[PDB]
Ligand binder design. Structure first.
Ligand SMILES: Cc1nnn(C)c1-c1cnc2c3cc(F)c(C(C)(C)O)cc3n([C@H](c3ccccc3)C3CCOCC3)c2c1
Ligand code: NA
Length: 125
């Protein structure tokens, strides 16, 4: 009846690459801190709508994003500007709030990670 879309692209080999203080901070400080949070595990890979039986997930969410994709993107120097990476983290949180309702365990988890994300991102060098 329903299948998953392909996961987001994690490499852009025809684009030029660079290291900046903000991109290193996004990988080694922001992503590293969120990845090891007690409630990070549902956000470390794309939503498997097939395994989780969510046939409406990819009908409601057209810009899926997850930390596993952000991690691979940062490791492949996918981002040239730190604001592109920040936008992917914000898309991941906004998708969770769009699909789910307050009081849902996944939302409580998302709100805790979002608080930690905002604390580290507000200190962006
Ligand atoms: C939905 C949704 N919307 N945004 N996100 C980011 C999600 C999301 C993403 N990944 C997982 C996920 C990955 C898993 F591997 C497992 C296993 C197979 C081990 O059970 C469960 C997983 N669930 C559960 C879940 C929530 C609602 C409906 C069905 C399943 C959560 C997990 C946390 O506790 C509460 C229930 C996810 C929800
Ligand atoms: Na909601």
């Amino acid at each position: 009846g329903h299948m998953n879309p392909p996961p987001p692209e994690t490499s852009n080999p025809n684009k030029p690459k660079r290291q900046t203080n903000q991109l290193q901070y996004l990988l080694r400080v922001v992503l590293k801190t969120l990845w090891k949070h007690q409630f990070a595990w549902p956000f470390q890979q794309p939503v498997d709508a097939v395994k989780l039986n969510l046939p409406d997930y990819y009908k409601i969410i057209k810009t899926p994003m997850d930390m596993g994709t952000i991690k691979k993107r940062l490791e492949n120097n996918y981002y040239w500007n730190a604001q592109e990476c920040i936008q992917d983290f914000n898309t991941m949180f906004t998708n969770c709030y769009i699909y789910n309702k307050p009081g849902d365990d996944i939302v409580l988890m998302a709100e805790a990670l979002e608080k930690l994300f905002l604390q580290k991102i507000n200190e962006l060098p």
